[PDB]
Symmetry: C3
């Protein structure tokens, strides 16, 4: 993509400009603030779209776009995505690629799933505080999970209204279409905004090597998880359900997996993977035709794991320990954000800010992730496809009732 | 109703489980927090629906569903309901069944009726503070009266637009339908959530007998008010307008009043009370046919008085003295909440939380009211019907212009 | 207008009642609070409409009502209006008719143009704070510019959807129609509310003469700016673009300029000014017919300058120095508020409260401006027309491509 080319030029232009300035001389903090500042505007403009995206997206999906295969598929996609998100979380916490009550954390999480007030859910979340007399208190930070939960119920209830709700469905489609023209417009300013964030990050850092390590270990963590998720869990889950040889199964899809690494798009890989399951594995076109193109938008195991790893890496870098509820929010938002980084065009960065905002994390560090994203995007696209493929397998085998 | 059977099983299951635990041994506060916790989820899920109910409900009612008899009826219903709400307030403050600046309180109330900002009205209300230099300051708590006032004006203005506003009417019907499917879904979780609140209330209390007294005196206060409201004020207002014998009037409707106590529903009592006024009193079918079925949704004198008593009883129990504005908010929200506990199905508990939230009261004590509600519901249903009946009377007499 | 007659009776009735009380004896502060109080209700009821007006207005305008002449006109109107707003600001700060970090002020402004959160933009704005460790912190005050920017993008994006967005256009027309029936209803209570504000202002003031001076100097500042804007800048911009004799140009429109001063309405002046440019200047009906009636709603150079002067005069009176960003907010809100004081009927006062709220200024001083507004309204209506007229000129000359 031009935007993909522009964003990487952008990273370079900003990396080089960042060193030139860093090696040039100490940059007065008000001059770094300014070099960064257009990049802060980019984060502000994306964060501004999170709320209207969540509401538009949820309502349009759960109503507008709602058999046995369907449940089989949907149950598969969601299970695998949460597995990848949790694996992400487990792995990032174990390897810990970053260097700078428990019950309450869980009850605050459950509390925040049911916000007393929707406008207040939009910009504030509940917390427990110790006075040893405990109290609930508000804290700044959009209650994302609470809002999502409300809008899932809202959105399912609207489906259960059928055409009686068609005017409300239509209203929220238009809102989605608009809000998506804006996430596209803003993403055109993204290369310059990324440039400025990076340029501003290099100049601030005390020791490039510490950050090169930390970011390197961040890349090893994502590839570990994609390897575990792609190479063990998904095949293992196929064998456990199909009692079939997964090594046989891979043999068929290898054309697709090659295609995924090269294309870095599951949409471009789509016609290849139809062939690989229809011809080589011999999966019934019906089970394919449903599951492959649906899976190419909602199943993104690999994008789930990346987002979970990335979120805690940013947390860890900014010397934040996540409480048990934060780490559960990360798993649930990583899952959803995955589903929507794939469903919403050029929402990759929006969905990262969703995750960071949900856990109340400093957002400017997203710059280093944008920097290494281009290498990782081909590898997670591979795990993303392989998942969809195994699904075709697990659905067809579980669909011999027919 | 199954829900009515389930909620009372729920109260029992929780009362017994509450004693078993209370008599078992001292329960560590973090274990009571947990026993209660599913019940806090119920309050959170209902409070979350208050805002979308008020907006949906107001707009759908004042526009969608808007002669001489009509004004006669509507002026009667509203007057009697405010009388019952104030009687409630007077009675509860006099008998005071609970044991743990004035101008400013009124101006803060009037201020809060006109909120400077609607989003801020949704989660915050104005207050006067003494520094002797007075200031306005925000306080946490949804400005319910302000929001309602805005949405009455909004909703009347939309009616005065006619079909020019039909798309906005339709949009807010669908929203109402949805928001009502959710208040139904949540009310199915209500028995378990009530169980857990009660279970959690018994275990916390130091002296069961003090609370049995206080709750008992709460029941005597409601029956006093239903007696005064049903037995004196309504007949007196009939005689004052009709110069007719009220004791004669009761003679006719006694079949209905019996039916009300047994049925505990004004909807089931409805065909009986048509008969009693058409046949026995000989009220013109026209004046009946309008006033009886409309009154069976919006006239609930007895549900108004109960809600006013209940609100201040919770206030009093939680060692809160209500300022003159709080007590006026209670009368106005008790009035509205009455009208909507009757108009919105399974909204009884929602409408209680509306009243408690409007006055910023601890909500968990709603449990004891849910506990004694089943005895009181047959008695207030009686006063509720008798009111509608007298109305048929007062409208027919005031409608001899014809 | 009756409202115009009533508001001036109102000012008098309140001026006289204010003196009577002021000369009567010292009025206990709680009795002044009360004399003022109905006027505070008026400010509250208008401020409550700002948000739904901005959203309704922006969406209905930028979508519903969106050639070369059109760009020529629109580029002219907007340029001249910002010139008048800045002239307003320059003049009021120089003459300074009122008696009781820089970069950060600009970055806070730019930050506030891109609000991280829309609900939070609705009632809160970002600020820099010094700890010399700088931080961002929220402050109470609706982020008007941020909200407007979001709703311009939103509104343009919806236009670029065409009829695909017709249901969302229709929805936001109805909302506009409603919100405008309310700004009309409230403006009928305005004379009494103005009366009470004034009555309350006289009684509080220590020295009438200081305030008569300050308000007098406020009137000299507006007339200076209308003279500079009307008499120098607009003709100069005509000569610079048309190389034509402006003194000739005025000769034609003098019938209109007379009509403007007398009528105090650009709508009543409208048929006159068609004649003056079609007959005397000989401007092509086409260029007139587009530009004159459009300009009679959106070009209000003179109303822009007044609002800018008025805003800083209120700031200055309330011993507030505006930071560089505040003064830029004033110029941008003064521009917009101009456009909408003209487009929205009886929104003059709403649009003043928009400007004061945008800069977080005490609003009750709007009373003195309402008091002197009647003299100034004929003079700014004159500059308002002259601007539209010169535009017809500058568009026709720049439209000889044809
Ligand atoms: C020294 C430090 C300097 C810092 C400078 C920071 C950048 C400030 C400017 C940001 C900016 O203009 O954003 C560019 C970005 C991208 O613009 P772009 O031109 O790079 O790419 C998109 C191009 N179009 C629109 C043709 C598809 O603007 C947007 O996409 C904004 C969308 C959100 C709009 C709502 C909030 C902001 C509203 C502002 C006013 C309207 C802007 C236009 C909206 C879109 C079209 C309708
Ligand atoms: C130890 C302490 C443990 C505390 C446990 C507290 C309870 C936590 C779970 C609460 C719960 O599930 O609520 C049950 C209740 C009632 O469920 P129920 O199954 O008891 O009764 C309703 C049944 N249906 C839906 C078939 C009619 O759920 C709702 O009704 C929720 C409605 C509001 C939804 C918006 C906010 C919450 C969103 C959460 C995710 C979606 C839930 C489904 C929504 C409805 C269907 C679309
Ligand atoms: C001693 C100190 C005393 C202070 C008293 C302050 C004034 C308090 C009362 C304010 C008031 O009534 O406002 C008058 C004003 C003006 O009323 P008016 O009668 O002067 O002029 C308008 C007349 N109509 C409506 C026929 C065109 O009311 C409004 O216009 C209110 C519009 C906004 C409504 C939303 C917020 C307020 C809701 C309150 C309840 C409904 C009111 C009616 C709404 C309009 C019709 C649907
Ligand atoms: C015959 O075939 C039928 C098939 C059925 C499709 O069903 C839909 C079910 C809901 C689902 C999974 C769909 C699309 C977008 C999905 C959303 C993207 C958003 O992303 C998020 C997170 C990130 C935010 C920035 C935006 O919102 C979520 C809240 C939102 C989301 C995950 C909620 C659920 C949505 C598809 C049709 O498929 C085309
Ligand atoms: C020919 O017959 C005509 C007749 C006319 C009916 O007119 C309507 C007038 C408005 C009215 C009284 C009606 C129904 C719901 C009523 C609402 C319930 C809600 O309850 C509340 C409080 C509690 C909240 C939880 C929800 O909102 C109020 C704000 C809301 C409410 C009290 C606002 C006023 C509404 C009926 C038709 O009758 C079927
Ligand atoms: C063939 O002729 C075509 C012509 C085209 C008209 O185009 C429209 C373009 C948008 C524009 C300029 C129009 C009307 C209201 C204008 C709004 C008034 C509001 O005022 C504000 C500020 C004050 C607030 C209280 C309300 O909102 C702004 C945000 C809002 C505003 C300035 C946004 C822009 C709007 C006209 C038709 O003309 C009839
Ligand atoms: C401050 C901003 C506006 C200037 C930055 C310059 C670069 C990075 C940006 C700004 C706007 C961008 C353009 C906006 C939209 C499109 C349309 C699309 O079909 C192809 C790319 C293209 C043509 C973009 C190319 C890159 C671009 C020129
Ligand atoms: C015998 C074939 C073996 C060697 C194949 C079967 C499946 C394969 C894996 C499938 C998917 C991925 C994810 C990718 O990002 C890195 C390589 C990795 C982890 C592959 C490595 C090789 C592999 C384990
Ligand atoms: C935690 C929750 C889900 C479990 C609690 C168990 C009990 C109290 C609840 C949970 C869901 C409830 C069911 C949900 C909805 C309906 C449909 C209605 O037509 C009859 C009652 C019925 C069938 C309910 C009976 C009681 C029920 C089984
Ligand atoms: C002669 C008939 C007398 C005794 C009748 C006429 C109306 C009756 C009242 C009507 C309604 C109620 C409300 C109910 O909740 C308790 C009894 C009470 C208060 C009744 C008591 C008996 C009563 C006073
Ligand atoms: C507290 C308020 C209601 C009382 C104040 C009295 C005066 C100032 C106000 C209140 C309501 C106003 C009326 C409301 C609306 C209209 C309709 C319009 O076509 C002509 C003017 C007219 C008829 C107004 C005249 C002035 C008026 C009588
Ligand atoms: C030769 C004609 C001269 C004297 C004319 C041409 C344009 C005229 C100006 C046009 C508009 C205005 C604005 C009005 O509010 C005050 C007078 C003022 C400033 C006029 C004063 C006289 C003027 C300067
Ligand atoms: N290619 C896959 C789908 C895929 O990976 N989607 C995706 C794409 C971009 C993206 O953007 C990010 C995320 C960050 F966290 C970050 F810091 C920077 C950027 Br830029 C996030 C997710 C397939 O099609 O299978
Ligand atoms: N039956 C009448 C109408 C009637 O009484 N409606 C009604 C029903 C349930 C209800 O629920 C509550 C309220 C509480 F305050 C509480 F604590 C617990 C519960 Br549960 C409130 C009002 C008729 O039809 O005439
Ligand atoms: N007449 C012009 C248009 C015109 O001036 N519009 C306008 C009208 C009223 C108005 O009202 C205010 C403003 C204040 F700041 C104030 F304090 C009090 C009041 Br009241 C503001 C702007 C034309 O038609 O050309």
């Amino acid at each position: 993509n031009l935007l993909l080319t522009l964003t990487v030029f952008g990273v370079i232009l900003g990396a080089v400009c960042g060193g030139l300035l860093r090696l040039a001389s100490p940059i007065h903090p008000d001059v770094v603030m300014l070099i960064a500042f257009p990049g802060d505007i980019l984060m502000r403009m994306l964060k501004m779209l999170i709320l209207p995206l969540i509401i538009s997206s949820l309502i349009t999906g759960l109503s507008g776009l709602d058999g046995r295969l369907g449940t089989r598929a949907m149950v598969y996609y969601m299970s695998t995505t949460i597995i990848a998100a949790v694996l992400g979380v487990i792995l990032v916490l174990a390897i810990h690629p970053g260097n700078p009550s428990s019950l309450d954390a869980f009850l605050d999480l459950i509390r925040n799933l049911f916000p007393e007030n929707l406008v207040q859910a939009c910009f504030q979340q509940i917390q427990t505080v110790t006075k040893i007399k405990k109290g609930l208190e508000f804290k700044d930070g959009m209650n994302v999970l609470g809002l999502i939960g409300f809008f899932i119920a809202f959105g399912i209830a609207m489906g259960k209204m059928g055409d009686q709700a068609k005017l409300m469905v239509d209203f929220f489609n238009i809102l989605n279409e608009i809000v998506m023209k804006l996430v596209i417009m803003i993403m055109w300013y993204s290369p310059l905004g990324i440039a400025c964030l990076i340029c501003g990050k290099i100049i601030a850092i005390k020791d490039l090597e510490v950050v090169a390590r930390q970011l390197g270990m961040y890349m090893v963590t994502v590839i570990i998880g994609l390897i575990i998720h792609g190479g063990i869990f998904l095949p293992l889950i196929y064998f456990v359900v199909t009692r079939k040889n997964p090594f046989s199964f891979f043999a068929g899809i290898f054309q697709a997996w090659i295609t995924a690494l090269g294309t870095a798009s599951s949409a471009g890989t789509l016609p290849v993977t139809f062939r690989c399951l229809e011809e080589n594995l011999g999966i019934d076109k019906r089970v394919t035709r449903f599951v492959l193109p649906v899976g190419a938008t909602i199943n993104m195991d690999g994008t789930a794991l990346y987002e979970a790893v990335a979120a805690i890496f940013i947390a860890q870098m900014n010397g934040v320990v996540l409480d048990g509820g934060q780490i559960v929010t990360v798993s649930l938002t990583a899952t959803l954000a995955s589903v929507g980084a794939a469903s919403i065009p050029s929402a990759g960065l929006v969905t990262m800010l969703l995750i960071l905002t949900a856990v109340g994390l400093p957002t400017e560090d997203i710059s280093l992730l944008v920097a290494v994203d281009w290498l990782l995007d081909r590898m997670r696209t591979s795990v993303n496809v392989v998942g969809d493929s195994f699904g075709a397998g697990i659905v067809y085998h579980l669909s011999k009732s027919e």
